[PDB]
Each structure stands twice: as structure tokens, then as C-alpha cells.
Design a protein around this nucleic acid. Structure first.
Ligand code: SSA
Ligand code: SSA
Ligand code: MN
Lengths: 421, 394
RNA sequence: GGAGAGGUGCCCGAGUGGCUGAAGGGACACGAAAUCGUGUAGGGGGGCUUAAACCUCCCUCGCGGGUUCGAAUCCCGCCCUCUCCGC
């Protein structure tokens, strides 16, 4: 959600954002409807002022006028009722249009679609094996960690791990939580479902609604990320300035429909319906300086996690057309997956300024007493099992076993993962 | 699913089981409908030796479809040692550990959560009633308990597994969750998928259609998966806080064994001792409860619940539920094995909770609370938490 | 799936139709141990103004709608909380 007052006064700023982000939105029709709504409000307020007048002047009034004054206030009520209905319809349509308005991206973001995504940093590189390397699926098959029977049970885009790799998945999640905890972030375990209000607050609705699984015969939807829950926690609250910034490390199972992924990542751990993810969520004051600081921290935290996992990664600056309607800036972190001979996303670091805060009604009281919309940020801490794909391939041994990075030995109690069958 | 031939030979035994388990099922209408399917098969065999033949096959389909939906409701006879009656007839087998002694008025787990800021009650507005969200050390504690249960089970000879929380209809039918407990399961809209209330649904479905080798038996699985349940109660101390919620985490013990009462009794005992030893290591007072036939479920041969003591309520609360189902699930899920004589037989299935959060946290908080309001960590969990006492956040 | 009790400002809480955007107590801040005094919601129009400040009007007493001359108060739907039952 953008500032409506700012939208009226700098509309070309938002029209340029619409184009660069590929949003299908008629900004002029939006501005036309807004002017209708504002006019109709003025009318309603005119009737409501008379309503309140007449109501105040009925009690102490001469009986000879009493009848006429009550009948007059009754007609005022019937007209306000007619205006409220007209205003209710128009504001509904204006809401649907306003939920599509994108936030203008930061100038440094490449303008274009996915093609314009541009690498900015690279740490470590493709490993050089003195043996023919195996893909992660094959490694799991060799070590007996893969349960292919799960597709018969649960359908495509499902997975089930066996043996040490199952314990490895749960260790990776705790490894990420412990890391985030000792970086100042408050750990939280959260549910994986919420009502529509929460998806509207983050921006997942309406733009990404087909990516969400709904729970039938309920008003609930399965969340694809703990961001949905963490962002909705403080809706309608006016937080104190001294509480800021809020740094949350929320773990929750994730569910994703993966609509429109027909033909992409059909086999493996890369693109499944249900996974595990530890989320970084930051709520800070309405300051570019503070947002830039939190953004850098979220990136560094994710990078450090990958450094401890001993994985070669790269940062990618995401282009306007691949960035999302609400994003000021987005930087993806990609880890190299040899079997695909290319880097694959593992994290997505996003600054959204007040765009989510204006949807979820996230506000704080600054030191001077002014209530202002906060700025929100989020980034992956660690998500399984996609990360396991890189871990298996980058840490495979000659004999087909998989090493465990130094930082994970205390969690697993072994230096090399033991096979099952 | 019960054996058809067994049902024809001894119908009185399955009348007794319907009465003692209280199943809304007319067995005489099922038997009559079974005879009616047999008569239609006697007409077709006379046409096979010698349009009218296709009309008898279009009636057969309908009759068989009705018979199948009605066979899925036939209960398994319980073991004689099970009390007859409802929940009131549940009999305490034993109890281990005494109620805790406090030199101060104990707090309930919600109050302990409020005091230390381990609670996020704002989740009710985000996700609706009957939800929870943990903060600080209690959040870390929940994840520690799950890894602890998986490490324990893995050292006890069970194969650890991380599993999805959704499956197709066949898997719920295969365990018995469908059609009896359909209204306890959330469906995923615009899919043919349903959210599982227990990893039992996935573990039982894995080997559907396979003939397992005798040597591979017994199968011992410790599957972890988030759990989803449509009914988490309404309000009150029975559901308040961490006690009953729509989504939770559970580590599931699941055993598939050969078709012998000896093998099943051995497995049943193992599932108990595992949960008991988990509760022992968690330093929690618990008790075992034999479940009566009417509170047992249609497919259960024997069910023992394990309950843990909750001081604020001065009562025991169910934390584990240990079941033996003989081949009642195997006949639904098509779980078969080859015995040493080379004969294909339906296997026996068992399951029991290993550990489920966050309900177990309610007992942990109240039983291990200190005077100042902190909560100590049992020795078995210090390596997982890195501290002896849970520190507060807010 | 039911029964009863509720939801008011920073919190507890008074309000059986207008004297209530709101008493009293606590908390906090400021000013003049205890005491006294003052202060203590958000949103949106309009006037004036560069702006701010100031003046004025409208909406919100969990959310939305309805009744009425008039609603925090009465009705309806939804949401949440507590206690007892159902599963
Ligand atoms: N379908 C999927 N299967 C497996 N992992 C996935 C899937 N979708 C996302 N992930 C993992 O979750 C991470 C976050 O995904 S994201 O949508 O791009 N970003 C977010 O959700 C933000 N909340 C920041 O985490 C991905 O980088 C990837 O590691
Ligand atoms: N709605 C719920 N909220 C919190 N915990 C629950 C909930 N439902 C079940 N549990 C926990 O999960 C355990 C297993 O529940 S059970 O249905 O009785 N048993 C099973 O599901 C069997 N598959 C064995 O686990 C319970 O004993 C309890 O500890
Ligand atoms: Mn209910």
C-alpha cells in the first residue's frame, strides 16, 4: 500500500514504478475513482453534520416543530444511508486498485525483467572434484536417504528423508535458529496458517494469491513463509520507539502451491509443496538509514550462515520486473549447485519500506510523539530441503558419502553422514 | 477392514465388537448386501458358460460400491483385557513418578508463559482461535524436544524420517481416519490433498501395494512431521494455552510387523517403553491407562494412553496414545508381507506417539517451575539447550 | 458441535438510549516520601496558512452492518477471551 496523499501529488513517480515492475494497473482510472470517493465523502459528511445537528435540537424543541424536526432527521438518516452504500461500493473497488499499486524501486535496481538480474558479489566458487560428482538425488539414493514412495502417498513435489539426512534437516533448522538467536534476533516458533488479512498485509494477496494453498471450508490459508505471520503480529498497534527495531527469527513450516511451475524442478529437493524455513523479520523506524542498516544485517547474517555451512554463494541484485510490487530493494543469495552447473536461490533479502506497514497497519510513535508507519524487512535465515541439495553435492566424498561442515559437527555428533541403505 | 471370510463364518463375534465399541453400523444389512453381491456373481458365471449380461454387471458395480463403503466401518474385535464401556471405563495400569512438591503456590503453564514472555497471544488475531506461537527460550525448547525425541528413537533402532503433513485420500482410508474421522481432517482446497493430523497417515501409506520380505520385518519408523487437526476444542482448561491447537509438531513411532500376536505384543511393549523412557528422561510424572472399547476406536485391538501430571489442574493429561490394530489397517492400506513358508499375508500395524509439542511443554513448565518463576531444564535436555534454566525474554 | 460470562481510552474498569470520545482508581510524563495541580488515542474533511500553529466538522467504545430524531448503551453477522460440556 502506498501513501494515497503521496500518490495524488507525485503520480508519475508511481506510473513509472508500475511500468518498470510490470504491474497491470490503470493509474489514471485509480486516480479518477479516488476523486469520486473523496467527493462522495464530502457529501456524506455534509449530511452527517446536519444529522448530528437535528439530533441535538430535537429534545429541547417546541412540540409544534417536534414532529417536523424528527421527520427531517429521519430523511437525513435515509440519505446518509444511501450515500454510505454508494461510498462502500466505490471504496471496495478503490481498495482492490490500491492493493495493486507498487512501491517505487530504489534507483540502483536494474530496470527490466528476470534477465536484468545482476550479480554483485561472489564468495567461493564451484568445487573441483578429483572424481565424477553425483547429483543430490543420486547421493541420497546411494546413501539410502531418499524415500521415493512419498509421491504415491502425497503426490508430486513432495519429499521424505531417511536416516542421518532426516536428522540433518532438523539440525540445519536449529543451527539457523541458534545463529539468529546469538545475533540479537528473538527466536519464535509459529503456525503455518493464517487468515486473509495477514496475506494482504505482506503483499502476498492479491498479487501472489495463486501461490497460496487455502484450507477448504475455513477462512484460513497455508502460509508460504513465516513472513506472513511475523508481519501480522503487530497489526493495529502503535509500538513505542524504544522497542525498535524489532528483530524476529521465526521458524515455521512453509506450504506453496507452486502454480505456474509446470516443468521447473520436477524432481528433487528444490521445489516442493511443503518445506521448513527460518525467517528473518525486521520492523524498524521510518528511516532509510535504519532500513539500509537492517538490510545489510539480514544479508550478512544469511551470508555468515552459508559461510558456516561452507557453501559457495553469490549475491544477485534483483531487477525491477523480478523484484515484486512492494520491494524497495531485493537481493537474492544463490548457492552453486554442480548438477545444474549454475547458482540457485536459497535466500531473498527484501526491503519494503512502509509498503507492508500501510497494508498491515504497522505503526510506531516516534520520540516527538508523531505516529508514523514503520518500515519492514525480511530475509531467509535458512530453508530446508533446498539447501540440502547444495550441501550434498558440495560436500560429497569420493566414496559417495557426504561430509558435515565444521559448524554442524556438534549438532550431528559426526564428521561424515552415515548411510542407511 | 476386516476379513470377509472371517465375517461370514463368525458374525456373532463382530456383532459383539460393534456393541462394545458403539459403532453406528447395521451388520445384518451388510451381510444381506454381501449375499446379494454373491447372487449376482452366480448369475454371471451361468452366462459365461452359456445385453442382459451387461445389465447384471452395471448393477454389480453399484452393489459393490455400497458394500465397500460399508465394509470400511466394520470394527476389529478388541482384546478381552480391554474394559467394556466408554471413557469412564478406562482403567489405570500404573503410574511412575510422584506429584511434584513445591514450597510455593505453583503457577499454570499459561501464567508461567506470560511471566517470562515466552508467549505470543497476538497469534489469535493472525491465525484465529486455538493457535499458539512461542518466543525466546521456549521456542528453542520446542525445537530441542523434537530433535531430542528423534535422537532417542534413532538410538532405539527406529529409522528417523522427516515427512510431509499432507496426503491423498487413499492414505487416510488406509489408516482408518477416513471415513470415520473425516470431520477431524482439514482438506487443501482445489487439490486432492488433505492435511494429516499425524505422521501415522504417511508412514502407514508408504508400503501400500508392496509385498515386504519377512527378513525386513519388523519395520520400525520414527517419522517427524507437523500435524494439523480441524477440531482443537473450543475454550477452557482442556484446550487453553498449549494443550489443544490446530497445528502442532509430533514425532511418531510406527511399527509394521508379521501377523502374529507375539510379534504385535512385543512391538506394543516397545512403543510403551520408548515413550516411557522419553518421559523418564524428561523428568515428568506419568501414568498408563488402558483404554476401554468404547473409547478405543474401530480399528484398535488394544490402546494404552500415557498421561502426564499437570499440577495446576491436579490431574493427568494425555500425551501419548499407543495402539495395536492387527491387520485392520493392513487390509485397508494393502500392507502385505511374505512369511517364511512363502505365503502372502497381511501384516500387523502398530503406532504410538514418541513426543508431540507443544502439549508436553505445558507439563514441563508446571512440573519444572522454580520459585522465582523460571523453569529448569531436565538433564537429558541440557545438551540441546545449552543452559540449565530457561531464561525469560519479557 | 453446544451452554454461560465478557470485549470501552496506556491498564483495570462507571456507563439499564441524549447530561459520555467518555467518571473514578492505577500507571506514565511534566510542573509545584507522601500529597496536590496539569497532561495522557487514532483516522479523515474544511477554513486560514508557504508550511506549521490555530479554528471547525465527520468516523471509530473488538470489527462490520442495522433500528432510532439520536447508539459506547438496543438488534444482526463476524472475530477474539474466560469457565464448563461435545468430539
Ligand atoms: N517451493 C520451494 N521448495 C523448497 N524451498 C523453497 C520453495 N520456495 C521457497 N523456498 C526456499 O525459501 C526461500 C525463501 O523464498 S522466498 O519466497 O523467495 N522469500 C521469502 O519467502 C521471504 N519471506 C524471505 O525468506 C527460498 O530462497 C528457498 O530457499
Ligand atoms: N489438537 C492437538 N493439540 C496439541 N497436541 C495434540 C493435539 N492432538 C494430538 N496431540 C498430541 O499428539 C498425540 C497423539 O494424538 S493421538 O491422536 O491420540 N495419537 C495418534 O495420532 C497416533 N498416531 C499416535 O501418535 C496426543 O497424545 C497429544 O500429545
Ligand atoms: Mn467447537
Amino acid at each position: 500500500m502506498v501513501d494515497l496523499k503521496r500518490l495524488r501529488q507525485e503520480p508519475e513517480v508511481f506510473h513509472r514504478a508500475i511500468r518498470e515492475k510490470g504491474v497491470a494497473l490503470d493509474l489514471e482510472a485509480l486516480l479518477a475513482l479516488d476523486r469520486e470517493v473523496q467527493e462522495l465523502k464530502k457529501r456524506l459528511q455534509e449530511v452527517q453534520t446536519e444529522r448530528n445537528q437535528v439530533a441535538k435540537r430535537v429534545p429541547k424543541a417546541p412540540p409544534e416543530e417536534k414532529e417536523a424536526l424528527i421527520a427531517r432527521g429521519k430523511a437525513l438518516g435515509e440519505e446518509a444511508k444511501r450515500l454510505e452504500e454508494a461510498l462502500r461500493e466505490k471504496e471496495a473497488r478503490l481498495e482492490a486498485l490500491l492493493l495493486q499499486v507498487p512501491l517505487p524501486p530504489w534507483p540502483g535496481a536494474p530496470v527490466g525483467g528476470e534477465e536484468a538480474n545482476r550479480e554483485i558479489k561472489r564468495v567461493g566458487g564451484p568445487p573441483e572434484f578429483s572424481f565424477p560428482p553425483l547429483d543430490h538425488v543420486a547421493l541420497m539414493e546411494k546413501n539410502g536417504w531418499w524415500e521415493p514412495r512419498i509421491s504415491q502417498v502425497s503426490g508430486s513435489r513432495s519429499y521424505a528423508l531417511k536416516g542421518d539426512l532426516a536428522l540433518y534437516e532438523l539440525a540445519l533448522l536449529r543451527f539457523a535458529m541458534d545463529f539468529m538467536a546469538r545475533r540479537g534476533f528473538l527466536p519464535m516458533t509459529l503456525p503455518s496458517y493464517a487468515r486473509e488479512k495477514a496475506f494482504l498485509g505482506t503483499g502476498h494477496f492479491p498479487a501472489y494469491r495463486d501461490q497460496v494453498w487455502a484450507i477448504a471450508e475455513t477462512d484460513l490459508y497455508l502460509t508460504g513463509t513465516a513472513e506472513v505471520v511475523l508481519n501480522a503480529l503487530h497489526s493495529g498497534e502503535i509500538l513505542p520507539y524504544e522497542a525498535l527495531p524489532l528483530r524476529y527469527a521465526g521458524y515455521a513450516p512453509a506450504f506453496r502451491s507452486e502454480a505456474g511451475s509446470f516443468g521447473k524442478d520436477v524432481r528433487g529437493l528444490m521445489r516442493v509443496h511443503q518445506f521448513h524455513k527460518v525467517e528473518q523479520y525486521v520492523l524498524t523506524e521510518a528511516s532509510l538509514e535504519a532500513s539500509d542498516r537492517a538490510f545489510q544485517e539480514l544479508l550478512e547474517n544469511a551470508e555468515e550462515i552459508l559461510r558456516l555451512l561452507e557453501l559457495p554463494y553469490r549475491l544477485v541484485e534483483v531487477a525491477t520486473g523480478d523484484m515484486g510490487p512492494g520491494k524497495w530493494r531485493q537481493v537474492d543469495i544463490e548457492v552453486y549447485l554442480p548438477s545444474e552447473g549454475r547458482y540457485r536461490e536459497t535466500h531473498s533479502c527484501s526491503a519494503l519500506l512502509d509498503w507492508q506497514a500501510r497494508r498491515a497497519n504497522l505503526r510506531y510513535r516516534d520520540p516527538e510523539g508523531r505516529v508514523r508507519y514503520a518500515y519492514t524487512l525480511n530475509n531467509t535465515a535458512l530453508a530446508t530441503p533446498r539447501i540440502l541439495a547444495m550441501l550434498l553435492e558440495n560436500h560429497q566424498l569420493q566414496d559417495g558419502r557426504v561430509r558435515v561442515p565444521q559448524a554442524l559437527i556438534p549438532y550431528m555428533g559426526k564428521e561424515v553422514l552415515e548411510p542407511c541403505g
